[model samples]
Target: MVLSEGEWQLVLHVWAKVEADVAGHGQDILIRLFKSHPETLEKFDRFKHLKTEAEMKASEDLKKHGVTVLTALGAILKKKGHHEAELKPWAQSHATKHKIPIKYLEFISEAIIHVLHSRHPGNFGADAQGAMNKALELFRKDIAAKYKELGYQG
Candidate 1:
């Protein structure tokens, strides 16, 4: 389904809140977001429980890699105006490549926010609004395309 502008904004803000892992920071955010939007739980029944454990058991190497990727992406969004245009194709490609459900993209923004905030608490600064704007722009583009791919016009 195509997200309305308001929903798109929410996605963006959430992504900006995501962080790298060290403590239970990302986990905490995930818990909060899930509690607030319990319906989102249907999107990842297969991996959600395992993901919780994986986060805790995540090796330093894996954590470092994830941090590098998230930080790099965040920086790009911050610098480049949050290229919402780019996210649709990116999400579509991933969905096709991984053969995952389109619904996975539905909650990615929230998931991203949850992870980032939990993992990199103080690392991110107060410029979260701008950061979220950028992330949301990308989210709109990605989900828009994914909705189309799934045969949903809107």
Candidate 2:
């Protein structure tokens, strides 16, 4: 599933808003999403607490790596079709792989990017892309560590 430029913009805006305050705003979005789709909450053991902390930390970490992912995603979206065929499935698959559940996956991606943009505003140009790539490597490593803590492995 691909995302359109317009959809990408919306996604970016949502992400920025959510990460505005280290999970402060992000938590609200999570709550609303879960409330609307309670079944998705079952994927996590301590859904509420986990969601809060994840949002906070992801917001912090995103400042460094977001531009990379966003830029990559932009390239992916260039060929996106009417169904948003690229992003929706990728989000669902990653969520399922991480036990994040379908409902919250969209929000998760949004929040991740938001945190990055918030952390590194002017640092998003081509010059910082290399650093962003390194940051993404660390981000994946950190996520793997978290999964181990939760008894899940990639």
Candidate 3:
């Protein structure tokens, strides 16, 4: 789904707010992702044994990684093109090093929407959600394409 120019502007606006508190927002999204799908936590060796929401929330490693992911996402949002120069390598690393599947990426996309709604209820409505969904869908498709090119059969 191609986002309209206005949608892109809305996404950028919302992202600015999110990026301001990367640690908090990023952790919130990750925590939501893990809590909603415990099976996903197994993919992260460091977080696999976390027994509770509080434990996951207290994980410094998890927080740091979440912030890193958000930082990369912020960069993508600010850029105009696929920026394949950056995204392809990052996607390859995620697919090869982390073995992260497309589903996990999809989960993060949804988690971000949820976080935005919960964090800034007044600002995140249908238009913002639609723009975010489109933006993330594009990212997911690009990353999955790169993942497939890396000799993965999925």
Candidate 4:
């Protein structure tokens, strides 16, 4: 729940390093998430029809959706641990409008961390990785709480 100052800095440092390619990196996270689980995209109209790696890679919708996802993540990271109140509205709408399974939330968390690791093999060391992992876990909890508060069962 609490990221040490150093850990928070690591998160932002890696975030800054990927600042130029947020869309690409976001797409990679979704791509990895999709490869392992189709259910997430199967319900996502924009990406549901993507049939191949090439098509998925070139999907403008995917790219846009990717940016949207990462943008929300960036906002959360920037808030550090004081994000629950701000996250509530987004979670309410997300849980109300989107039908992705709760399990996918966990997978997306894994996908993000995995993509970070693969993309920055040398720089995203264990410390940063652990910090990011904890950060995401906190985010997931906040979202899940809102989802339940909205009376939707996971």
Candidate 5:
């Protein structure tokens, strides 16, 4: 947890742009994730059938699950103090059974950053971008550590 207090504040700051529209926030980024890396859909049996971005954007399953995913992340962002504990455990389940290699979530992070930066012309800048990268990258690393411990080679 090398992330500084300001980074958390900064992350939560920009998060305000889309926090209210959690469904819109989450679904758009998920749509971006699949757009940027369509291979990511392979993890979800229900969603792998979505062959095009048009289908993915219109997917009710993707929309609903995207809300669930972002809501969980929103809860984590609220937990400023013990985020390490919160962030690490979620990977264990995936590492043990799903064996999702963890790169997929990194793509999720990238999609999030893309959603913020590409979507916001003036609000997102170097410091905000840096903070988002550090915060989300820490998330990636923490989950990767759990994967290593679980011995899944993901």
Candidate 6:
């Protein structure tokens, strides 16, 4: 799932537009994921009861967490294929302390792709989308493998 240099460039270029709005984009991704998979909300004690966009937007925790996730993602993108270095610790923490299922972790990739396609519209063409998809796929695999080694079953 490695992205070619040109693909990586495309992803980076498109991501730049959303980088400054990480909180907004990240929240949108979470909102979309929760809407599509309400069951996933159960994993977030603070966000589980947030039934509307307004409720989600009002939560400081949600905003902070979104920023954290997006910041990590930005790091991953900036570092190219060195995602494991940035993701492994969070994967371990989420698996051990948060008890986040592997499926939910995998769902981040889906959310990211959906957000890019829907939010950016004309900015995210096939090449950019494909690059992001591949990068996220690799990220998911890396995190899944690391978490599995930590005894994560889900």
> After superposing candidate 3, which stretches have Cα over 4 Å from the reference?
none
lDDT of 1 by residue, 8-91 (tens): 454445554453232344344344445555554444444345345345345444345345445545554543444555555555
Task: Tell me how many residue pairs clash in candidate 1.
Answer: 15
Candidate 5 is scored at a TM of: 0.89
Two-way TM-score contest, 1 vs 4, winner? 4
All candidates' lDDT scores?
Answer: 0.49, 0.44, 0.83, 0.83, 0.79, 0.82
Encode model 5's per-residue lDDT on 25-136: one tens digit a residue. 7889988987788787777887888887788778888889988888888778777646777766677667875667777878888899888897774768888899888877
Tens-digit lDDT track of model 4 for 1-154: 5778888898888998777798999889889988887777776876778988789898888889889889988988999789877787787767778754478789899998899899897769998998888888887877777788887746
Which segments of model 6 are wrong by more than 4 Å?
A: none
lDDT of 3: 0.83
Better model by TM-score: candidate 4 vs candidate 6:
4
Q: Candidate 1 vs candidate 3: which has greater lDDT?
A: 3
How do the residues 1-154 of candidate 6 rate in per-residue lDDT, one tens digit apiece? 6678998898898889888798998888888778778888988887777878789878888888888888888888888896667777888778888888767766767888898898788889887888888887777777778877889855
Q: Give the alpha carbon lDDT tens digit for every residue of 1-154 in model 3.
A: 4667888898898888887799999899999998887778888887788899989888898899899989988898877444678897787778878788888888878888999999987778898888888888888887778878897624
lDDT, candidate 5, equals: 0.79
Stretch of 10 with least lDDT, candidate 5: 80-89
TM-score, candidate number 4: 0.93
Count of backbone clashes, every candidate in sequence: 15, 9, 0, 0, 0, 1
- Model 1 RMSD in angstroms: 7.5
